[PDB]
Design an enzyme around this catalytic site. Structure first.
Site, PDB file in Angstrom:
ATOM      1  N   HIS B  41       7.914  56.990 -23.724  1.00  0.00           N
ATOM      2  CA  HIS B  41       7.257  55.681 -23.603  1.00  0.00           C
ATOM      3  C   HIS B  41       8.199  54.619 -23.020  1.00  0.00           C
ATOM      4  O   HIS B  41       7.709  53.536 -22.691  1.00  0.00           O
ATOM      5  CB  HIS B  41       6.537  55.211 -24.887  1.00  0.00           C
ATOM      6  CG  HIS B  41       7.434  54.773 -26.001  1.00  0.00           C
ATOM      7  ND1 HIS B  41       7.481  55.443 -27.216  1.00  0.00           N
ATOM      8  CD2 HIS B  41       8.223  53.685 -26.077  1.00  0.00           C
ATOM      9  CE1 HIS B  41       8.313  54.747 -27.974  1.00  0.00           C
ATOM     10  NE2 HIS B  41       8.775  53.681 -27.332  1.00  0.00           N
ATOM     11  N   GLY B 143      13.302  48.076 -30.026  1.00  0.00           N
ATOM     12  CA  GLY B 143      14.528  48.553 -29.419  1.00  0.00           C
ATOM     13  C   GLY B 143      15.157  49.738 -30.135  1.00  0.00           C
ATOM     14  O   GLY B 143      16.085  50.345 -29.599  1.00  0.00           O
ATOM     15  N   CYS B 145      13.729  52.637 -30.829  1.00  0.00           N
ATOM     16  CA  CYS B 145      13.212  53.918 -30.363  1.00  0.00           C
ATOM     17  C   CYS B 145      14.281  54.723 -29.667  1.00  0.00           C
ATOM     18  O   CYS B 145      15.198  54.145 -29.085  1.00  0.00           O
ATOM     19  CB  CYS B 145      11.948  53.766 -29.523  1.00  0.00           C
ATOM     20  SG  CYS B 145      10.481  53.331 -30.494  1.00  0.00           S
TER      21      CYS B 145
HETATM   22  C1  LIG Z   1      10.663  51.636 -30.987  1.00  0.00           C
HETATM   23  C2  LIG Z   1      11.038  50.875 -29.735  1.00  0.00           C
HETATM   24  O1  LIG Z   1      12.205  50.635 -29.452  1.00  0.00           O
HETATM   25  C3  LIG Z   1       9.962  50.439 -28.832  1.00  0.00           C
HETATM   26  C4  LIG Z   1       8.573  50.501 -29.134  1.00  0.00           C
HETATM   27  C5  LIG Z   1       7.880  50.023 -28.050  1.00  0.00           C
HETATM   28  C6  LIG Z   1       6.410  49.882 -27.846  1.00  0.00           C
HETATM   29  N1  LIG Z   1       8.810  49.677 -27.116  1.00  0.00           N
HETATM   30  N2  LIG Z   1       8.546  49.155 -25.862  1.00  0.00           N
HETATM   31  C7  LIG Z   1       8.411  47.819 -25.737  1.00  0.00           C
HETATM   32  O2  LIG Z   1       8.533  47.037 -26.682  1.00  0.00           O
HETATM   33  C8  LIG Z   1       8.097  47.320 -24.338  1.00  0.00           C
HETATM   34  N3  LIG Z   1       7.691  48.297 -23.550  1.00  0.00           N
HETATM   35  N4  LIG Z   1       7.328  47.994 -22.253  1.00  0.00           N
HETATM   36  C9  LIG Z   1       7.335  46.779 -21.674  1.00  0.00           C
HETATM   37  O3  LIG Z   1       6.958  46.639 -20.516  1.00  0.00           O
HETATM   38  C10 LIG Z   1       7.784  45.675 -22.524  1.00  0.00           C
HETATM   39  C11 LIG Z   1       7.849  44.376 -22.020  1.00  0.00           C
HETATM   40  C12 LIG Z   1       8.318  43.348 -22.823  1.00  0.00           C
HETATM   41  C13 LIG Z   1       8.714  43.601 -24.122  1.00  0.00           C
HETATM   42  C14 LIG Z   1       8.643  44.884 -24.642  1.00  0.00           C
HETATM   43  C15 LIG Z   1       8.176  45.935 -23.847  1.00  0.00           C
HETATM   44  C16 LIG Z   1      10.089  49.914 -27.551  1.00  0.00           C
HETATM   45  C17 LIG Z   1      11.306  49.607 -26.747  1.00  0.00           C
END
Ligand SMILES: *CC(=O)c1cc(C)n(NC(=O)c2n[nH]c(=O)c3ccccc23)c1C
Ligand SMILES: *CC(=O)c1cc(C)n(NC(=O)c2n[nH]c(=O)c3ccccc23)c1C
EC number: 3.4.19.12
Lengths: 304, 304
Positions: B41, B143, B145
């Protein structure tokens, strides 16, 4: 989200652990720069335990009697000295894995991570609190002496504890890295009073804020209290009196949640007077006091 | 003596953590040999979260879009592939700190240490259990993950978990290192049923043996039970049914303490039916199930 009793990553400390053997005794030492620190009772035999004269015992020892091993390689001891209850063995090689470090004396109620070791080898890491009575409730078997307590700020390890003793009651006692015991304890095999312990109020309140942040809110109520009224309840339940300094330390958590510190005290008052009624908070059925307000902010903000 | 929820020393795993950035997303990767493993992801944008087509999303990415940083040094990505829910980024440099390792799939009820990381930097380490419903109750912020779960046997790290998701209920889900989720979970932002969880009976019994070994014995009684009778109580209280395999695993603890497994079951039966009555066992006011029988033997024997 989620809230766990988290220890510091132990890698920087693992690289400092060595084995120290003197006579038949083996325990752990901490190798920082060209010095190895360890409990002075490594020089005791079983006949010395009850009342050792460390000065006389150490006079019978020479550099070559202190066997210091870092993994499979032997360290050469070129000096030895006793500072309070610790021995400092000067070696001819600086530990190449010495991290940035400080020796600090923690206050009662503060937390730190312990890297439990046996034969200079790490077995596990856990977080605990220095109790208000200067004992710790750790996990220390024979051979664990010389295991250290620490905190990490970015890349600097502040060592605050070295393990020395298990009192006959099963609680633990030790020293700062200058060999000064925390509390009234002495390194002798004798019955030693630890003194009345109390629950660390400011840490319980911090943990209640962590619970609200992480979704556990059932204990919030419609009440408030004052420091005076709260402290009458704290007195009854053997909790440390809450001061304005504690309220100020809880400020950032109060700001984040919108819950005034005295309102959180009122929730704590009700929990003390009425119990949990079979419910849990952050997976605990008791009021947890091993998280400082700094620990709660750090874990809730993901500091590395 | 003393018994703590102890994590494995995290140094060997700290040396494997890297930061992986794809587009705007940043999370952790695990660098072992010349491969970096991370949740797939990392390629999702916020519009993809609800129902990502990972195959199509990954086709838009090239090696140069995966920014892999180990501390302050950049790693060069020479290949990428998706295996189940993980991405494997082949890099041109083998991690010089790669420990001896295995990828294993742990069973529900087993425990492991998690090294919580942010931006490839370790923040803390804690011990937890894989719940019978294949969720974990961790401490994972945005962050985190790509943070991994592991066990250590001597010098070999068996990685068993990689963090991917926080369900809307606040519980955590992730995969083995081949990217297969534990449980029914999918890497999509949707409501996902975790299913009925149970208490890990064999671990509670192990922890009761740790309590007796460490001096907490108030819960011992004059009673015994059978597997059938105990399991009727386990059914009522949402505990996993105890099997002869569980009794056999508890054998060494039963031998050490002299307390027959079914006699310990009778103590557990009474504690379930009557509660703690305001007392504690090993500093807990509930029946702890995050210590396996192996964890109890290991900590009680000081394995490094
Ligand atoms: C567990 C972890 O670190 C985690 C969970 C999820 C869903 N994400 N991704 C994001 O928070 C994220 N993913 N894609 C994007 O385009 C984002 C844009 C802005 C803020 C967060 C985004 C992570 C890293
Ligand atoms: C905490 C720890 O590791 C620790 C505590 C104590 C008292 N010791 N020393 C011994 O157990 C010990 N000390 N001197 C001897 O001459 C011994 C002979 C045999 C067995 C144990 C001895 C340690 C290491």
């Amino acid at each position: 989200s989620g809230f766990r009793k988290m220890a510091f990553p132990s890698g920087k400390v693992e690289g400092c652990m060595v084995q120290v053997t003197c006579g038949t005794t083996t325990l752990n030492g901490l190798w920082l720069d060209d010095v190895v620190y360890c409990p002075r009772h490594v020089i005791c035999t079983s006949e010395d335990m009850l009342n050792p004269n460390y000065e006389d015992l150490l006079i019978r020892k020479s550099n070559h009697n202190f066997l210091v091993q870092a993994g499979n390689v032997q360290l050469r001891v070129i000096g030895h000295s006793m500072q309070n209850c610790v021995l400092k063995l000067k070696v001819d090689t600086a530990n190449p894995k010495t991290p940035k470090y400080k020796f600090v004396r923690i206050q009662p109620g503060q937390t730190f991570s312990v890297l439990a070791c046996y034969n200079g080898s790490p077995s596990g890491v856990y977080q605990c609190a220095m109790r208000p009575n200067f004992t710790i409730k750790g996990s220390f078997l024979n051979g664990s002496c010389g295991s250290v307590g620490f905190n990490i700020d970015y890349d600097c390890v502040s060592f605050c504890y070295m393990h020395h003793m298990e009192l006959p009651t099963g609680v633990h006692a030790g020293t700062d890295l200058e060999g000064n015991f925390y509390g009234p304890f002495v390194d002798r095999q004798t019955a030693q009073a630890a003194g009345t312990d109390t629950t660390i109020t400011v840490n319980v309140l911090a943990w209640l804020y962590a619970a609200v942040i992480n979704g556990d809110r059932w204990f919030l109520n419609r009440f408030t209290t004052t420091l005076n009224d709260f402290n009458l309840v704290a007195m009854k339940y053997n909790y440390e009196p809450l001061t304005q300094d504690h309220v100020d330390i809880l400020g950032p958590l109060s700001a984040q949640t919108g819950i005034a510190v005295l309102d959180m005290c009122a929730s704590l008052k009700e929990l003390l007077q009425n119990g949990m009624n079979g419910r849990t908070i952050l997976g605990s059925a008791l009021l947890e006091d091993e998280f400082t307000p700094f620990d709660v902010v750090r874990q809730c903000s993901g500091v590395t």
